[PDB]
Amino acid sequence: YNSGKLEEFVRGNLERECIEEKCSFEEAREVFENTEKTNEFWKQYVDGDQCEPNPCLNGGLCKDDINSYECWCQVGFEGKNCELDATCNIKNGRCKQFCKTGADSKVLCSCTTGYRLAPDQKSCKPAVPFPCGRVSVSHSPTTLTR
């Protein structure tokens, strides 16, 4: 609030300043430090979270912004509001490896021998210390040929 008696002279504690009454952004910023992280602490706090009553359906994860907002749809759903179903031809069906329609109309991903389908149902994680087709020297330990 900045109204007691010499409360700037103390290290900011945003537990205190921000959602007592309500803090400024600067108050919030010197206390946060990383100001990526401030920008979004931010867009949720007030101006009517454009993510109001979740627009993205089909389990879509709505992510609000200052002005706009978008939508992360996991799997089997396309379109800015995850209304459209994912069909194997528009952007590989969202699968990182192989996708085929089946038993209905929504996609179904897969991976080549050696890899397994990640929990998102679209990515591929190894399942053998040496999966097929990967240049190993560059990767090891956790680098890239620059």
């Binding site: 080549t112 040496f130 097929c132 190993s136 040929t145």
Partner: protein
């Protein structure tokens, strides 16, 4: 490989050197720990072949090298009875003792029929192999690689007098300069799709090397990928 560049050690974990009568006569690509792949026209009746996984510079003994002996060579059923010796120009070599899979000994990915063609028409692919660096000038001592643009049928068919079968495809620079040459057959033709690298055709033949109007012609893996699948099953 004519007009290519030297590859970095470990950059091609599936690139295998095939030593046999006279050595370095063909290359190959590891399908998996026990079975490698190469072109049928490398299987000379009555010779003993030794796969040289993990090899790099022929003049020196790389600690990564892992030799094996072929106990069975299964060329594609309908290879060549006495007809165009580059049709189903593909074969599987069954190593006796499994290789030790590591950073330098890693298989290539075999896509299903659909995706293999899909990755082929993406435009470019890597072709690596130990062979003639000059069109009949000298062989590759240190593993060489080159990036070769898939060349459309209409153009391919015209450049060659030879009936360019469905089983194959063209790929190479329109002008004379860069291409695979003798001592590369059976090598790989891979197309990497975001890190992971897949096999899109075995490197087969070509009228001479590095001369304009000509393109290297490779085997359409898409056709036998399934054969490979069933042929290398472990369980």
């Amino acid at each position: 490989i004519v007009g290519g560049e030297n590859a970095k050690p470990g950059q091609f974990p599936w690139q295998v050197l095939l030593n046999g009568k006279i050595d370095a006569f063909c290359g190959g690509s590891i399908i998996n720990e026990k079975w490698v792949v190469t072109a049928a026209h490398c299987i000379e009746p009555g010779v003993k072949i030794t796969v040289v996984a993990g090899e790099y510079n022929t003049e020196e003994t790389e600690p990564t090298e892992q030799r094996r002996n072929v106990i069975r060579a299964i060329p594609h059923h309908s290879y060549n009875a006495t007809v165009n010796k580059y049709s189903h120009d593909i074969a599987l070599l069954e190593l006796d003792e499994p290789l030790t899979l590591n950073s330098y000994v890693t298989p290539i990915c075999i896509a299903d029929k659909e995706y293999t063609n899909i990755f082929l028409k993406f435009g470019s692919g890597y072709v690596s192999g130990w062979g003639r660096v000059f069109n009949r000038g000298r062989s590759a001592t240190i593993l060489q690689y080159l990036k070769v643009p898939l060349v459309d049928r209409a153009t391919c068919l015209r450049s060659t007098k030879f009936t360019i079968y469905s089983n194959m495809f063209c790929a190479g620079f329109h002008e004379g300069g860069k291409d695979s040459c003798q001592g590369d057959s059976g090598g790989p033709h891979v197309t990497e799709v975001e890190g992971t690298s897949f096999l899109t055709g075995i490197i087969s033949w070509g009228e001479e090397c590095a001369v304009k109007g000509k393109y290297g012609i490779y085997t359409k893996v898409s056709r036998y990928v399934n054969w490979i699948k069933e042929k290398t099953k472990l369980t």
